[PDB]
Amino acid sequence: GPGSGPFADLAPGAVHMRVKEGSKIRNLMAFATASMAQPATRAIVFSGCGRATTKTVTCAEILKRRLAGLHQVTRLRYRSVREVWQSLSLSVLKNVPGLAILLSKDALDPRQPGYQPPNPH
């Protein structure tokens, strides 16, 4: 509906987890680690914006500690937020910073923007 996900160009078969303010890390990570424990899952994406941007990064960082050897790409972006105003109705849009992070078991092009190699155990 909303198009293909982030990283459809690099890893279309990756599971995409949207991280929101309401999301619970230990629960979100439980699913992510279980997913990535399987051999059929080669990669995963975490994305979020605004009040969940920091949490999105934390989720990625936790998985890199639970599974060493993952290749990473981080992509920066903006996402819209609707504000209704009547102060000195009226729908007004503004951009909020965000990001999407790909983590994969398989090698990624190391020269592309946002690439980060696996950490040494």
Partner: peptide, 9 residues
């Protein structure tokens, strides 16, 4: 200008 991000803890 271009930008590129990495993350850490």
């Amino acid at each position: 200008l271009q930008v590129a991000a990495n993350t850490s803890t």
